[PDB]
Design a protein around this ligand. Structure first.
Ligand SMILES: [Ca+2]
Ligand SMILES: [Ca+2]
Ligand SMILES: [Ca+2]
Ligand SMILES: [Ca+2]
Ligand SMILES: [Ca+2]
Ligand SMILES: [Ca+2]
Ligand SMILES: [Ca+2]
Ligand SMILES: [Ca+2]
Lengths: 182, 182, 182, 182
């Protein structure tokens, strides 16, 4: 209809500006599960299509960052795997890490996207240019985000956002070409 | 309709009284799976939104307790992570642990909520003020509970109950504010 | 309708005779997944409601057995957890293990139930009194079984069969009572 | 309708020619998840029905190969379990491995099937006789494949392709017979 075209255009205009995507970890890059053993070892589960999404953004000159409440070494191992250097762990209130990232990169609020699932993500989701909820996000986060993914956290929701941004900016071909050559 | 309004109000009136939520572990705080390796190590998988749910109740002055048949050290590690001190392990029949918790806290039956999935939860679900079934509960538990969650165990069902209670008591803002300041 | 009543009765008459349930492991007591690490350690994931199902059958005097192609020690650890002594590992063709179990127990073919998901289960599913497919079974197994569960393997499908058998035989109350007293 | 019959026949004619199935690993033989622990150990999860699918192809004289970007030892352990000798790891661009496999086997492009989920699979999916997308594949891969499975990667999608090929070639009975005799 007329309304879905308008809304689709307004979303595309937000995504056209994006120079950095920020992700939360648990519930967004993961399914939300914390796997714990009898000895207290911990694991999380990440999805390969999301890891490819982040690598495609970076191949296209779009920066990637993480801001998480998680503190464990699983996060460090995953960030190292993906070559993500801008990341912040143990952040219970996330506003201060966002402001630090903003200073580091020199970007306007509207040049960030942020994808979240729970209440501590809410102020970042409302502040940035493109605030995104995974489909399994808590009710307030689904309510107040600019957009929500079809897929759930850890199942390709972050890839869906990566592809939206690349497509909006006509960088999808650049990204895969650049990725495949490294 | 008239009937859904009445029922919604009756549920809210139960939730308004709640001073302690009691959870079962396997099938409720987890998906129900027991992951076992070749050496007999075991793991369970918990969900971060449920862990946040429990922390929000506690930030709002609502106590949390666990009563489980599980005996393994996974449970202890998770309870320590969440700062939950009232918990009972290896309880095959759960009535005696409930009565002990009741004595410890000094609460009326109707000031407890209990969220369960299987037959040993049934007498507790029927006795407390707000007896809750996860959506994947066995048929009798779904039948006799006061309410059932939309979500399944380990996927945010306990968070859905936490949010119902906080919302009923107008403590949702208090809870997130209090959480974010620690 | 008339037809669903007939079929429901014919299924109940099969279940009334059952003196032993036989389960396959991978895909039936599990989701089907084999979790493998970098060092070749392996895990499988079992569901607590299915473990309770098997314990309820045994509390009601119904025997339980496993016949599996799996050979790894995960299976032994799980059987020990559940107190299941009649079980057969590494059986690629399963007919010979079934005949051995039949000799051991002294039962007629029609006093066995068998729940399976893949082609090597087919001859057992067709031979026993109550041959059952998990809902995620391969197409031929769904086709030729007497009945299929609503739930998938490792998610409570075996419990659904346990409850059908107990209900048919009016042993559900006996079973939970007997379980809760040990 | 007339159109679904034509398309079903055209798909069957592709599958009749197949002398080798090539699979990707992560997202195709797995759910896509990478499970990572605090020490950097990694696991993936494979599905037993897919492992049986591959063994049935091989019992019927159809070769199996893997081409993956994954480099970790999980892959080697799984290939050894399944007796798959033709496989290629760490391939970021996959075209060169395909050409090497083609030389090794002496087959025409149209005698290969390939099942994929992400952009680096696309040129192989378009080149081979039967290019297949798992149902959870990224949008371009779903778009350009000859066929897509109903099931998702790691949940029996590869088995669904194995069964299509065996059925098209009237080798399903040969395959199970041959499997069950080893
Ligand atoms: Ca989160
Ligand atoms: Ca906004
Ligand atoms: Ca339970
Ligand atoms: Ca009640
Ligand atoms: Ca099986
Ligand atoms: Ca039969
Ligand atoms: Ca892949
Ligand atoms: Ca093609």
């Amino acid at each position: 209809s007329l309304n879905t075209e308008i809304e689709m255009n307004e979303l595309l205009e937000k995504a056209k500006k994006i120079k950095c995507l920020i992700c939360d970890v648990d519930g967004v890059l993961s399914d939300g599960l914390l796997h714990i053993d009898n000895h207290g070892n911990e694991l999380k589960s990440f999805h390969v299509q999301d890891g490819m999404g982040l690598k495609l953004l970076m191949a296209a000159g779009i920066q990637v960052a993480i801001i998480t409440t998680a503190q464990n070494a699983v996060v460090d191992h995953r960030m190292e795997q993906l070559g993500i250097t801008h990341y912040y762990k143990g952040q219970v209130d996330k506003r201060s890490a966002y402001q630090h990232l903003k200073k580091t990169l020199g970007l306007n609020d509207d040049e960030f996207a942020y994808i979240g699932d729970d209440l501590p993500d809410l102020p970042l989701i409302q502040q940035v240019g493109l605030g995104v909820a995974v489909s399994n996000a808590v009710p307030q986060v689904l309510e107040f985000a600019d957009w929500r993914t079809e897929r759930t956290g850890g199942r390709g929701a972050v890839r869906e956002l990566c592809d939206l941004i690349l497509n909006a900016q006509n960088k999808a071909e650049l990204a895969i070409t650049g990725y495949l050559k490294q």
